Amino acid sequence: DVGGQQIFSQALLNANRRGEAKTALAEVQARHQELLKLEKSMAELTQ
């Protein structure tokens, strides 16, 4: 035969992407602790 075959295609993500808890967005934990510290200090200052 000839020109008797078509083809589909699939896709893989990036390795650098890896997980979802990869800091800069997941380290919002540590940052939240910073923000809570900020909030406590501001509460005192406003008082």
């Binding site: 979802e20 808890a21 967005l25 997941a26 919002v28 934990q29 940052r31 939240h32 923000l35 809570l36 900020l38 909030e39 501001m42 509460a43 200052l45 406003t46």
Partner: protein, 51 residues
């Protein structure tokens, strides 16, 4: 992760609210300026009484 970010948003909102509340210190400066003008008057009356 989403929950922590939401908590961070709420925290920064409250911090901003309180900071604005703190700023509304200016009423204290206004009052201190008023009391300063009064004390300037007290000083003038005292000087006159010395004479």
């Amino acid at each position: 992760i989403k929950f922590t970010k939401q908590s961070s948003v709420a925290s920064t909102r409250n911090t901003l609210k309180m900071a604005q509340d703190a700023e509304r210190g200016m009423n204290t400066l206004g009052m201190l300026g008023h009391q300063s003008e009064q004390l300037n008057n007290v000083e003038g009356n005292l000087d006159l009484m010395k004479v």
